[PDB]
Design an enzyme around this catalytic site. Structure first.
Site, PDB file in Angstrom:
ATOM      1  N   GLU A 239     -24.514   8.222  40.915  1.00  7.54           N
ATOM      2  CA  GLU A 239     -23.320   8.770  40.308  1.00  7.54           C
ATOM      3  C   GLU A 239     -23.806  10.021  39.303  1.00  7.54           C
ATOM      4  OE1 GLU A 239     -21.671   7.318  36.776  1.00  7.54           O
ATOM      5  OE2 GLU A 239     -21.375   9.255  36.820  1.00  7.54           O
TER       6      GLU A 239
ATOM      7  N   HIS B  15     -25.781   3.693  39.376  1.00 10.52           N
ATOM      8  CA  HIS B  15     -25.627   4.658  38.551  1.00 10.52           C
ATOM      9  C   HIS B  15     -26.148   5.815  38.479  1.00 10.52           C
ATOM     10  CE1 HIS B  15     -24.626   5.702  34.157  1.00 10.52           C
ATOM     11  NE2 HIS B  15     -25.984   5.437  34.075  1.00 10.52           N
TER      12      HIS B  15
END
Ligand SMILES: CCCCCCCCCCCCCCCCCC(=O)OC[C@H](COP(=O)([O-])OCC(O)COP(=O)([O-])OC[C@@H](COC(=O)CCCCCCCCCCCCCCCCC)OC(=O)CCCCCCCCCCCCCCCCC)OC(=O)CCCCCCCCCCCCCCCCC
Ligand SMILES: CCCCCCCCCCCCCCCCCC(=O)OC[C@H](COP(=O)([O-])OCC(O)COP(=O)([O-])OC[C@@H](COC(=O)CCCCCCCCCCCCCCCCC)OC(=O)CCCCCCCCCCCCCCCCC)OC(=O)CCCCCCCCCCCCCCCCC
Ligand SMILES: CCCCCCCCCCCCCCCCCC(=O)OC[C@H](COP(=O)([O-])OCC(O)COP(=O)([O-])OC[C@@H](COC(=O)CCCCCCCCCCCCCCCCC)OC(=O)CCCCCCCCCCCCCCCCC)OC(=O)CCCCCCCCCCCCCCCCC
Ligand SMILES: CCCCCCCCCCCCCCCCCC(=O)OC[C@H](COP(=O)([O-])OCC(O)COP(=O)([O-])OC[C@@H](COC(=O)CCCCCCCCCCCCCCCCC)OC(=O)CCCCCCCCCCCCCCCCC)OC(=O)CCCCCCCCCCCCCCCCC
Ligand SMILES: CCCCCCCCCCCCCCCCCC(=O)OC[C@H](COP(=O)([O-])OCC[N+](C)(C)C)OC(=O)CCCCCCCCCCCCCCCCC
Ligand SMILES: CCCCCCCCCCCCCCCCCC(=O)OC[C@H](COP(=O)([O-])OCC[N+](C)(C)C)OC(=O)CCCCCCCCCCCCCCCCC
Ligand SMILES: COC1=C(OC)C(=O)C(C/C=C(\C)CC/C=C(\C)CC/C=C(\C)CC/C=C(\C)CC/C=C(\C)CC/C=C(\C)CC/C=C(\C)CCC=C(C)C)=C(C)C1=O
Lengths: 79, 55, 176, 164, 454, 54, 496
Positions: free
Chosen positions: E63, E60
């Protein structure tokens, strides 16, 4: 195959009042867009649980009234 | 409503109301309900004095 | 499995009678035997038994209505669901006079009195409820077909209702 | 499948691999082998699919399942075609009569070349449909065509490879 | 019972999806459409599941920082270039799959491939960018800043998958978020973002050959493969409760109940899609043309009648599939005093699939399932998500015709067989937030998966 | 040639009344017709004696 | 083209008399009851989804979509586009919105929306909605300021049924007294839905203040007090006879064969008479400006909007003003947009990046046939209102000049928005219907792109100068206890 839309279709107009396809910004990410892709702050997946109806929940609002009662009147034992 | 039932069926021997009305099938039609005569202000039939003279 | 075979038989039969004209909408000619029976029994039976008996009952009913000062359509009981659904939609002017006539009748009947003869010259058999009875039957037939075509399964004895179909809470002995 | 049994992936791999080789190693040409065994294969195949469902993407169990399913597809297809050939051969035999004498000879097949054309076309379809099962196809259907070729003179691509 | 085929000639009139495998192992899939806009992206097989407990949250973090500058470009230059093309770079990361796509005009298809390749292959994970994102992620991580639907979605996985990595959340625990550094992200890129796990999807006025030539040029230096993933057992479904009883958050209670579902490639997956459509969804504030009291959906109709008020402010079914497991259930948002009626009614509805499901409800559900699926394929991004998600899930894209062909075979009897095998008398997981005095014990709710009648 | 909206508006059930409705239906003004006994006839004289004791 | 209507040429569709028996053969086949059945085991019960099962698929037939125009003999215009999708979007647009209401007719446009899909001459309310539900269709009705739209979304094989149901709303609805009275509930729900959307609620406050008690300032929604007096079937029928006519209606269909759509619509009006077209009072909007401070005791934030009148959709300033909106762009703290999502618009750079106390700043632009509103919308905490207004005013004073880089970025982002918004079918349907109602013409996305490329800095300066000469409209919503007075805003803008 994957389902990309909520099980409850909106049934409303996508464009806001007075705003056209030309002047609505980009419907993919604009804040006022009704079809913007939600932001995955916590990751992808929760949109399967998500409630897409913009109106906040009013707990206990009556929808089972068949016309037997006026608003504000409390039924007593169903009658 | 409480447990209840109506005889809304397709009989084998009795016709439906649409096929054979049991009422006197003569009605007057208006364009708006306000065009109907007012019974309170409408004269009724002349009163009789004998039960044998009733209409 | 025999149920599967039975299900196919039912499907094929019903598919073979779709669009059939109802018996009442067929132009039917009486058989040569029913015509003879109508020629002999029916006229004599009407003259001697049916005609006089039914006139006697009808004339009594008209007198009873005139004594109470009510119409025939007033006499309908609202415990019947079609009557209740029709009464929901009757216009106010019809409603007002219906209530007043029914109240006067009950007072007269309870006090063992009869309407003065001056007020009895009216036809009690005017069908003023007919438009609304027919609308109510249409509304109920639509609901029957589009919403009640199968025996539905529901959780039992929950929310004040047995779960067997009734919609009012506390409307049976076992839901007290 | 309705079952409460539980298996590890190692057990599931073993069951799927055992069934795959059992089917492929069996002699499909003998009709009785398929008649007797297919009922056992189906019962096992139902269990194997249920336990191997979570491993359809597994790098080991996955390929075994695909081969197992493909082999079962080919087995049914080859059996059906060869079953029809057996009927044609049996009809020809009965047409010979009693003791091959014609004593009570039956009616012959009047469209034998058409049947041969139809069977060979099906044979070609199997080869294209199942490129990785040619050894089994030749065992059942290919050999069947060779037997028919003795009765009737027809042409098929692999005829020369059967000494015709 | 079989009522015929619903496949039409129009279903066959769709441009084919061409998928080719580049020598490095990257699949390139494209579908032509008569549009002036396109969607090009990389759908990669990666996510929180493939992270270890200590490193959970790295994917995460990566990203969010991937588009914040590259070695060749800078954040301002990259953002300026995309804006000049009139495009917008998007991305998301999930438990099992990740995507980095760009919505662009026709002239920007090939330029966007270059930008996306540079971000994925040469990310400049600047420390300043990482530290600013750490603050943003930390705020996001707080439960007060999360919606109740998001909380329950994560808690359903935490409760159901205690023994495996699917229980991990995408954002990760706060302890890991505090410690993630550039090296963590660099390792994750090296191990997970490899050619064998990537699919380049282009939808729009595109030519398959041209996209393939550009893809081979721009992704030439990608790592060809990484070691095969560890072999693991079927994820164990733990029947458990994880309920956050809070009477200081208002009247509404949020409940999610889950059953064990099926993997993507299961033969029963389409049956579970149909069962999800039969459960449907309802909202008191968006009832639709048909009111609840007269709905064809049996769960909705019985619910609307309860106490003359209705016992469902909102509910939806859910069907979540992963490579080797799945979750099937419903989510409810309802008044505190209504929770027992709501969970009882939505469980009675699921149990009914095993006993008494009518052909009428199935056929309605098939049509509304098809409407949802086909309408999702209207825009290029919808098509691109479908191509990328399907190729990752199945290795191929199922055509609309094939989906309808397989759905035609499914009937009330097939739903009953699958439900009897998998959902009847099955184990369940319950999760919740809010005032939940009415919610009963797990064992009490687990007895509602079978009926005394029939 | 009437607009269908106008045509269907006439066939509202409220627009049909039986012939003679206004000349037959009773319109009661009271539940106690003239000539019937009521409280105005049974009231005791104002010089009466208390009736509570009995 | 056989007929030119309001600048567009249509192909005239002739009415034809067809026996009911013949047409019944063409109606799509479906069932409501399944009395028995033929049992058949799922043949793919043992086939994993990764294995293809369909073979011998007919080759696809792809055609470039084109918009086609037709009109019936009664004057109803039909516009359809076939993108070869599997779901259709049927839309009926009628040129009767709230702007055509007289003060005694307040809320009647909304009332028409509330009674939509109720009983018609040949169908009951229940049968209409159960048919829509059983066939998996969704939709509804929405009444706007200039038009009212009926829309259905459905699988394209059921188009014949859907078109009939939509048309019945305007052809022969039975506005029965008891059915209409059951729709009084929707008024309260409509208010709740509107007020929930803060952005839309502020937009309605703008229009009511911008156009004081005239066409575009009429309330969109009916009130629940004195308005209910004329919320009656008779009143609604009289309103529909004034405005609803085949000449003011347009039927739009996306992903539907044009010839089939025209054929079925023709059969619906073949044996019936549509509402005749009658002249009506059409007055130009009167822009007055003004201000309104609407307190919301619950909200701690302050939503401020400052707007100016624009000539509208039919003007030559439509594109330059739209480019001005994209140049200024805007954004909000709530979202964290990635590249290409407005991070470099002027408002984002000059306001959001430099003022941490600003919760959100955006530029809005509403366009109608002959009028519109342009302005800035900025939000923040209540005590910050004096500073929020100063920020907004400062940006309005910077519209005198624009850099070449900003103009090019704005033009490219606008073109991207146009093309990307167009690919949504519901958006395309609503765009086409509104354009024909507003202008009688459809401008395609590509043609709008050509116009966008021709916008120069001179055009932006000219359009901005005109907007700033109008009397501002000043709306504050939420926590208004610290906002500046209206005269402060006007004096600040009086210099321009
Ligand atoms: C060796 C001996 C062996 C013996 C073996 C015997 C085995 C027998 C097996 C029996 C199995 C059980 C059957 C039970 C059936 C239950 C059905 C049911 O409940 O349905 C409800 C169901 C509810 O329907 P719904 O939609 O809710 O309502 C319908 C509406 O009301 C309106 O519907 P609609 O408008 O469509 O009308 C349909 C029509 C359809 O009607 C029919 O088709 C029925 C016709 C029946 C005719 C019977 C005539 C018998 C004449 C005998 C003559 C003997 C001649 C001898 C000559 C001698 C010469 C030497 O119905 C009507 O018109 C009205 C029906 C009224 C029914 C009343 C029921 C009363 C039952 C009890 C009667 C006896 C008790 C008193 C006497 C006891 C002591 C003697 O009703 C129907 O659908 C109608 C069915 C009516 C069935 C009645 C059958 C009566 C049979 C009597 C037999 C007598 C035998 C005498 C023999 C004498 C020999 C000498
Ligand atoms: C007028 C026009 C022409 C008319 C033509 C009429 C045509 C019909 C007649 C011909 C019928 C042919 C039937 C062929 C049957 C095929 C059999 C076969 O191959 O099997 C496949 C067949 C179906 O297999 P499948 O495909 O998997 O389907 C499963 C379903 O069963 C599939 O069933 P389903 O799903 O469809 O559900 C219905 C099911 C179930 O249907 C029912 O059960 C109907 C229930 C309706 C309510 C009944 C209420 C009670 C009424 C009583 C009335 C009494 C009146 C008395 C009057 C007296 C005065 C006159 O039906 C059956 O199970 C089929 C029954 C087949 C025949 C065998 C049983 C017949 C009854 C025998 C009773 C004997 C009583 C003796 C008393 C002695 C007294 C001293 O196998 C069975 O299931 C058949 C057996 C069923 C159970 C029967 C009882 C077995 C008892 C075993 C005892 C073991 C004792 C061990 C002791 C160990 C000690 C150590
Ligand atoms: C020679 C030897 C011969 C041997 C021969 C042997 C023969 C063996 C015979 C075996 C028995 C056969 C009986 C056949 C009856 C057929 C009647 C019929 O045509 O029904 C159609 C009829 C449908 O009528 P409809 O007008 O079309 O629509 C009905 C509604 O208006 C509107 O309908 P809707 O569908 O719109 O409404 C929805 C709702 C409609 O729901 C209902 O209609 C239910 C009505 C209320 C039922 C509860 C009543 C309250 C409790 C009464 C008992 C009190 C005391 C109990 C404990 C005592 C302990 C000391 O439907 C559902 O909920 C569907 C699912 C229903 C099953 C739920 C399962 C869980 C609950 C368990 C109870 C119900 C089991 C099924 C019925 C069993 C019938 C025997 O359905 C029923 O009759 C419903 C069942 C009601 C009767 C229950 C009786 C229970 C047993 C009592 C003791 C009896 C002793 C007397 C002798 C027994 C032997 C004969
Ligand atoms: C040719 C031969 C012919 C032979 C003829 C005989 C044929 C055999 C069968 C005869 C019996 C038929 C039974 C029919 C069952 C019907 C079931 C049913 O549908 O019920 C619901 C149904 C209501 O319909 P519904 O409203 O549509 O249902 C929807 C609601 O959900 C319904 O819900 P709901 O709540 O509105 O209604 C429920 C209703 C249902 O109940 C009833 O209406 C009565 C039903 C049962 C009837 C009685 C059966 C008696 C027979 C068994 C006993 C035999 C003993 C023999 C011993 C011999 C020893 C030597 O009420 C109740 O449930 C009341 C329950 C009260 C219980 C109170 C218990 C005491 C307090 C608690 C415990 C104690 C405290 C704790 C202490 C602790 C200590 C520490 O019931 C009725 O309407 C029918 C009631 C019965 C009417 C009469 C039936 C006549 C039958 C025809 C043949 C008669 C032949 C002549 C006989 C002459 C005798 C002298
Ligand atoms: C030489 C002389 C020859 C004479 C031949 C005998 C003629 C007699 C014919 C009349 C009696 C039999 C038919 C009755 C029809 C009405 C019943 C019916 O339909 O039920 C309604 C209902 C059916 O309703 P439904 O669901 O079909 O709905 C129809 C509803 N309406 C009527 C409103 C349109 O029956 C049932 O619910 C099930 C009935 C099961 C079967 C009952 C028994 C049938 C008879 C068996 C033989 C027993 C008598 C003979 C034995 C020997 C005697 C010595
Ligand atoms: C020769 C002539 C012969 C004639 C034969 C006639 C036989 C008639 C027999 C009548 C029996 C009626 C039983 C009804 C049971 C209660 C109703 C029911 O099913 O409710 C469904 C309803 C609905 O269930 P549900 O399906 O909604 O379940 C939802 C989820 N759970 C399972 C968690 C509740 O059941 C209940 O809620 C009731 C509680 C369960 C009751 C179980 C049965 C009780 C058995 C009693 C024990 C003693 C028996 C002794 C007998 C000895 C032998 C003689
Ligand atoms: C068909 O060809 C064959 C095979 O396929 C090639 C085999 O595989 C096999 C191997 C198979 C087996 C070993 C399986 C077991 C086989 C068995 C038991 C034998 C089966 C064959 C038979 C029984 C033969 C069928 C029956 C017959 C030929 C009938 C025998 C009796 C006959 C011919 C007598 C009939 C004579 C008459 C009608 C004449 C009557 C005379 C008169 C009227 C004269 C009257 C005079 C006066 C004066 C009045 C065989 C045997 C075979 O024949």
């Amino acid at each position: 195959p994957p389902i990309q839309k909520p099980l409850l279709p909106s049934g409303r107009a996508v464009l806001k009042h007075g705003r056209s396809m030309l002047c609505s910004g980009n419907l993919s990410y604009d804040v006022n867009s009704t079809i913007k892709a939600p932001e995955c702050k916590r990751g992808m997946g929760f949109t399967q649980f998500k409630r897409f109806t913009p109106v906040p929940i009013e707990s206990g609002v009556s929808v089972g009234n068949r016309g037997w009662f006026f608003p504000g009147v409390i039924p007593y034992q169903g009658h | 409503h409480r447990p209840t039932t109506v005889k809304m069926i397709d009989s084998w021997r009795t016709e439906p109301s649409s096929e054979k009305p049991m009422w006197y099938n003569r009605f007057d039609q208006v364009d708006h309900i306000s065009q109907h005569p007012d019974p309170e202000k409408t004269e009724k039939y002349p009163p009789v004095d004998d039960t044998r003279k009733l209409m | 499995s025999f149920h599967r075979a039975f299900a196919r038989v039912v499907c094929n039969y019903n598919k073979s009678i779709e669009g059939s004209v109802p018996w009442y909408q067929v132009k039917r000619e009486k058989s040569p035997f029913q015509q003879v029976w109508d020629e002999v029994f029916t006229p004599i039976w009407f003259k001697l038994v049916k005609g006089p008996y039914e006139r006697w009952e009808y004339n009594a009913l008209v007198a009873r209505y005139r004594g109470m000062g009510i119409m025939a359509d007033d006499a309908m009981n609202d415990k019947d669901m079609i009557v209740e659904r029709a009464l929901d939609i009757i216009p106010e002017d019809i409603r007002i006079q219906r209530y007043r006539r029914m109240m006067r009748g009950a007072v007269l009947a309870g006090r063992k009195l009869h309407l003065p003869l001056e007020l009895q010259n009216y036809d009690p058999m005017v069908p003023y409820m007919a438009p609304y009875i027919e609308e109510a039957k249409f509304q109920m037939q639509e609901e029957q077909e589009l919403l009640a075509y199968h025996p539905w399964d529901r959780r039992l004895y929950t929310a004040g209702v047995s779960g067997f179909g009734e919609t009012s809470m506390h409307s049976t002995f076992l839901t007290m | 499948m309705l079952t409460v049994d539980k298996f590890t992936r190692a057990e599931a791999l073993q069951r799927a691999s055992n069934l795959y080789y059992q089917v492929l190693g069996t002699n499909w040409e003998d009709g009785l082998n398929l008649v007797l065994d297919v009922p056992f294969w189906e019962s096992e195949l139902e269990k194997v699919d249920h336990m191997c469902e979570p491993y359809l993407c597994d790098d080991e169990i996955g390929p075994i399942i695909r081969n197992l399913h493909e082999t079962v597809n080919c087995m049914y297809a080859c059996e059906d075609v060869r079953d029809h050939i057996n009927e044609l051969l049996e009809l020809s035999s009965r047409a010979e009569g009693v003791m091959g004498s014609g004593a009570a000879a039956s009616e012959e097949v009047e469209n034998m070349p058409e049947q041969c054309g139809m069977v060979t076309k099906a044979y070609e379809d199997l080869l294209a449909r199942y490129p990785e099962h040619h050894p089994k196809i030749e065992q059942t259907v290919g050999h069947g065509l060779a037997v028919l070729r003795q009765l009737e003179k027809f042409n098929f691509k692999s005829s020369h490879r059967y000494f015709f | 019972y079989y009522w015929g085929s619903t496949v039409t000639t129009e279903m066959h009139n769709v441009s084919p999806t061409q998928v080719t495998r580049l020598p490095n192992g990257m699949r390139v899939a494209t579908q032509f459409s008569y549009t002036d806009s396109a969607t090009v992206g990389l759908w990669i097989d990666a996510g929180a599941r493939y992270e270890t407990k200590e490193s959970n949250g790295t994917a995460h973090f990566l990203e969010r920082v991937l588009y914040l500058g590259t070695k060749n470009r800078s954040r301002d230059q990259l953002e300026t270039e995309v804006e000049n093309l009139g495009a917008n770079l998007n991305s998301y990361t999930g438990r099992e799959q990740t995507a980095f796509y760009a919505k662009t005009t026709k002239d920007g298809i090939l330029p966007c491939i270059d930008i996306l390749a540079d971000c994925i292959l040469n990310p400049k994970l600047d420390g300043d960018e990482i530290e600013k994102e750490r603050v943003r992620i930390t705020q996001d991580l707080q439960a007060v800043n999360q919606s109740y639907e998001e909380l329950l979605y994560d808690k359903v996985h935490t409760a159901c998958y205690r023994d495996c990595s699917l229980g991990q959340t995408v954002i990760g625990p706060e302890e890991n978020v505090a410690t993630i550094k550039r090296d963590h992200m660099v390792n994750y890129l090296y191990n997970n973002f490899t050619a064998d796990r990537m699919v380049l999807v282009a939808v729009g006025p595109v030519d398959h050959a041209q996209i393939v030539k550009e893809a081979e040029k721009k992704f030439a230096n990608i790592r060809p493969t990484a070691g095969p993933r560890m072999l693991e057992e079927k994820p164990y479904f733990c029947a458990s409760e994880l309920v956050y009883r809070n009477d200081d958050m208002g009247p509404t209670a949020h409940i999610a109940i889950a059953y064990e579902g099926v993997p993507w490639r299961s033969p029963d997956y389409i049956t579970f899609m149909l069962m999800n459509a039969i459960i449907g969804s309802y909202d008191k504030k968006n009832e639709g043309l048909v009111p609840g009291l007269q709905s064809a959906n049996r769960i909705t109709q019985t619910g609307a009648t309860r106490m003359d008020v209705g016992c469902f402010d909102y509910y939806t079914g859910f069907n979540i599939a992963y490579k080797d497991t799945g979750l099937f259930g419903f989510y409810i948002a309802t008044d505190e005093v209504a929770v027992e009626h709501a969970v009882g009614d939505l469980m009675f509805g699921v149990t009914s699939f095993s006993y008494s499901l009518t052909e009428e409800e199935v056929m309605k559900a098939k049509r509304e399932l098809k409407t949802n699926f086909f309408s999702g394929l209207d825009n290029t991004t919808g098509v691109a998500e479908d191509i990328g998600r399907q190729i990752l899930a199945y290795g191929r894209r199922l055509s609309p015709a094939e989906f309808v062909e397989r759905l035609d075979q499914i009937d009330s009897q097939e739903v009953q067989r699958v439900a009897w095998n998998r959902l009847h008398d099955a184990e369940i997981t319950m999760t919740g937030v809010g005032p939940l005095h009415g919610l009963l014990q797990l064992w009490d709710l687990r007895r509602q998966t079978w009926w005394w009648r029939y | 040639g009437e607009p269908a909206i106008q045509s269907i508006a006439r066939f509202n059930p409220d627009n049909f009344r039986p012939v003679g409705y206004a000349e037959n239906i009773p319109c009661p003004d009271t539940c106690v017709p003239e000539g019937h006994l009521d409280f105005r006839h049974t009231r005791l004289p104002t010089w009466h004696a208390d009736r509570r004791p009995f | 083209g056989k007929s030119t209507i309001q600048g567009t040429s249509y192909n005239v569709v002739k009415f034809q008399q067809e026996d009911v028996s013949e047409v019944v053969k063409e109606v799509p086949h479906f069932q409501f009851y399944y009395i028995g059945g033929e049992h058949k085991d799922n043949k793919y019960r043992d086939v994993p989804l990764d294995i293809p099962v369909l073979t011998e698929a007919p080759p696809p037939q792809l055609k470039k979509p084109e918009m086609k125009f037709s009109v019936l003999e009664n004057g109803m215009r039909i516009v359809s586009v076939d993108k070869q999708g599997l779901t259709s979007n049927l839309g009926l647009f009628v040129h009767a919105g709230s702007r055509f209401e007289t003060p005694a007719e307040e809320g009647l446009s909304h009332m028409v929306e509330c009674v939509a899909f109720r009983s018609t001459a040949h169908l009951s309310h229940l049968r209409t909605i159960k048919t829509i539900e059983v066939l998996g269709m969704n939709g509804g009705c929405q009444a706007g300021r200039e038009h009212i739209m009926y829309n259905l979304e459905l699988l394209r094989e059921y188009m014949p049924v859907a078109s009939t149901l939509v048309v019945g709303n305007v052809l022969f609805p039975r506005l029965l007294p008891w059915e209409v009275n059951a729709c009084h509930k929707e008024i309260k729900k409509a208010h709740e839905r509107l007020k929930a959307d803060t952005d839309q609620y502020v937009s309605e406050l703008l229009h009511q203040t911008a156009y004081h008690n005239n066409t575009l300032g009429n309330a969109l929604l009916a009130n629940e007090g004195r308005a209910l007096e004329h919320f009656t079937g008779d009143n609604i029928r009289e309103f529909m006879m004034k405005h609803f006519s085949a000449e003011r209606s347009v039927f739009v269909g996306i992903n539907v064969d044009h010839d089939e759509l025209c054929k079925w619509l023709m059969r619906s009006f073949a044996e019936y008479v549509a509402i005749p077209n009658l002249p009506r009072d059409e007055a130009k909007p009167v822009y007055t400006g003004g201000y309104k401070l609407e307190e919301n005791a619950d909200m701690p934030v302050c939503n401020i909007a400052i707007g100016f009148e624009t000539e509208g959709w039919n003007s030559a300033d439509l594109v330059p003003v739209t480019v001005l909106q994209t140049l200024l762009g805007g954004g909000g703290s709530f979202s964290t947009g990635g590249p290409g999502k407005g991070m470099h618009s002027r408002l984002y750079l000059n306001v959001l990046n430099q003022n941490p106390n600003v919760e959100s700043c955006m530029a809005f632009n509403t366009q109608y046939s002959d009028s519109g509103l342009f302005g800035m919308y900025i939000t923040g905490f209540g005590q910050e209102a004096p500073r929020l207004v100063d920020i907004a005013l400062n940006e309005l004073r910077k519209l005198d000049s624009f850099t070449p880089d900003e103009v090019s970025r704005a033009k490219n982002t606008l073109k991207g928005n146009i093309f990307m918004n167009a690919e949504n079918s519901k958006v395309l349907m609503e765009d086409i219907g509104r354009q024909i109602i507003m202008s009688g013409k459809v401008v395609t996305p590509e043609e709008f792109a050509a116009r966008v490329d021709a916008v120069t800095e001179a055009d932006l300066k000219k359009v901005a100068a005109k907007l700033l000469r109008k009397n501002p409209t000043y709306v504050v919503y939420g926590d208004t206890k610290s906002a500046p007075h209206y005269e402060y805003v006007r004096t600040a803008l009086a210099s321009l």
